[PDB]
Design an enzyme around this catalytic site. Structure first.
Site, PDB file in Angstrom:
ATOM      1  N   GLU A  63       0.839  -1.190   0.000  1.00 20.27           N
ATOM      2  CA  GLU A  63       0.000   0.000   0.000  1.00 20.27           C
ATOM      3  C   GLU A  63       0.877   1.243   0.000  1.00 20.27           C
ATOM      4  OE1 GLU A  63      -1.985   0.245   4.047  1.00 20.27           O
ATOM      5  OE2 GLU A  63      -1.521  -1.898   3.984  1.00 20.27           O
ATOM      6  N   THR A  64       0.440   2.266  -0.731  1.00 20.51           N
ATOM      7  CA  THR A  64       1.203   3.505  -0.806  1.00 20.51           C
ATOM      8  C   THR A  64       1.357   4.115   0.582  1.00 20.51           C
ATOM      9  OG1 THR A  64      -0.809   4.769  -1.277  1.00 20.51           O
ATOM     10  CG2 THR A  64       0.445   3.937  -3.166  1.00 20.51           C
ATOM     11  N   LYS A  65       2.573   4.550   0.897  1.00 22.19           N
ATOM     12  CA  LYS A  65       2.857   5.127   2.203  1.00 22.19           C
ATOM     13  C   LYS A  65       2.371   6.570   2.257  1.00 22.19           C
ATOM     14  CE  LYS A  65       6.844   5.993   5.216  1.00 22.19           C
ATOM     15  NZ  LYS A  65       7.665   5.282   6.235  1.00 22.19           N
ATOM     16  N   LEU A  66       1.759   6.935   3.380  1.00 21.48           N
ATOM     17  CA  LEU A  66       1.126   8.235   3.550  1.00 21.48           C
ATOM     18  C   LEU A  66       1.968   9.116   4.462  1.00 21.48           C
ATOM     19  CD1 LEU A  66      -2.531   6.976   4.117  1.00 21.48           C
ATOM     20  CD2 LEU A  66      -1.557   7.845   1.982  1.00 21.48           C
ATOM     21  N   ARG A  70       0.711   9.876  12.732  1.00 15.97           N
ATOM     22  CA  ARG A  70       0.142   8.635  13.245  1.00 15.97           C
ATOM     23  C   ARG A  70      -0.704   8.923  14.479  1.00 15.97           C
ATOM     24  NH1 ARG A  70       1.744   3.172  13.635  1.00 15.97           N
ATOM     25  NH2 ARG A  70      -0.036   2.017  14.491  1.00 15.97           N
TER      26      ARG A  70
HETATM   27  O1  AMP Z   1       9.587   6.545   8.557  1.00 18.47           O
HETATM   28  P1  AMP Z   1       8.681   5.977   9.621  1.00 18.47           P
HETATM   29  O2  AMP Z   1       9.175   4.693  10.241  1.00 18.47           O
HETATM   30  O3  AMP Z   1       8.179   6.982  10.624  1.00 18.47           O
HETATM   31  O4  AMP Z   1       7.369   5.553   8.826  1.00 18.47           O
HETATM   32  C1  AMP Z   1       6.396   4.706   9.426  1.00 18.47           C
HETATM   33  C2  AMP Z   1       5.299   5.496  10.094  1.00 18.47           C
HETATM   34  O5  AMP Z   1       4.383   5.993   9.077  1.00 18.47           O
HETATM   35  C3  AMP Z   1       3.078   5.507   9.334  1.00 18.47           C
HETATM   36  N1  AMP Z   1       2.425   5.244   8.050  1.00 18.47           N
HETATM   37  C4  AMP Z   1       2.529   6.019   6.956  1.00 18.47           C
HETATM   38  N2  AMP Z   1       1.793   5.513   5.934  1.00 18.47           N
HETATM   39  C5  AMP Z   1       1.191   4.395   6.377  1.00 18.47           C
HETATM   40  C6  AMP Z   1       0.281   3.372   5.813  1.00 18.47           C
HETATM   41  N3  AMP Z   1      -0.156   3.446   4.533  1.00 18.47           N
HETATM   42  N4  AMP Z   1      -0.104   2.361   6.619  1.00 18.47           N
HETATM   43  C7  AMP Z   1       0.317   2.262   7.891  1.00 18.47           C
HETATM   44  N5  AMP Z   1       1.140   3.157   8.462  1.00 18.47           N
HETATM   45  C8  AMP Z   1       1.604   4.228   7.775  1.00 18.47           C
HETATM   46  C9  AMP Z   1       3.267   4.272  10.207  1.00 18.47           C
HETATM   47  O6  AMP Z   1       2.093   3.938  10.916  1.00 18.47           O
HETATM   48  C10 AMP Z   1       4.444   4.700  11.073  1.00 18.47           C
HETATM   49  O7  AMP Z   1       3.994   5.557  12.121  1.00 18.47           O
END
Ligand code: AMP
Length: 71
Positions: A63-66, A70
């Site tokens: 899934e595309t990361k958002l 959080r």
């Molecule tokens: O770089 P990082 O480890 O902080 O990134 C992870 C965090 O980003 C949240 N995130 C962003 N996009 C999503 C999706 N699509 N699904 C679940 N989590 C996501 C993570 O929860 C985490 O905090």
DNA sequence: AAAAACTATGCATGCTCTACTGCTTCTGATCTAGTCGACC
């Protein structure tokens, strides 16, 4: 013995200090509870050519990361 | 007729209000730079 897990589940030092006061008397079960912040589940660095080995050879979700916050 | 007493007055002092103008200082409004909290 299980202070860290309870703290992660509840995210409050007062509850951990009060409930886990006696050393011998622990908590039988510990899991996410209502109105109690719990540590989010993070993700580790992803290997670009070992994904299957990381997934144990089963179908996986992508899934595309958002970029947000959080909650 | 001549001397003494009372009243008019009037000019100057100091006080008092009343205002005006200047300087010093306190309060308030506004602008700009720095700082803290949350996250990622
Ligand atoms: O770089 P990082 O480890 O902080 O990134 C992870 C965090 O980003 C949240 N995130 C962003 N996009 C999503 C999706 N699509 N699904 C679940 N989590 C996501 C993570 O929860 C985490 O905090």
């Amino acid at each position: 013995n299980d202070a860290a897990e309870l703290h992660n589940v509840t995210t409050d030092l007062e509850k951990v200090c009060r409930q886990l006061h006696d050393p011998s008397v622990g908590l039988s079960d510990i899991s996410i509870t209502l109105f109690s912040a719990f540590k989010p589940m993070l993700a580790a660095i992803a290997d670009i050519e070992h994904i299957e080995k990381d997934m144990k050879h089963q179908s996986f979700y992508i899934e595309t990361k958002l970029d947000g916050e959080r909650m």
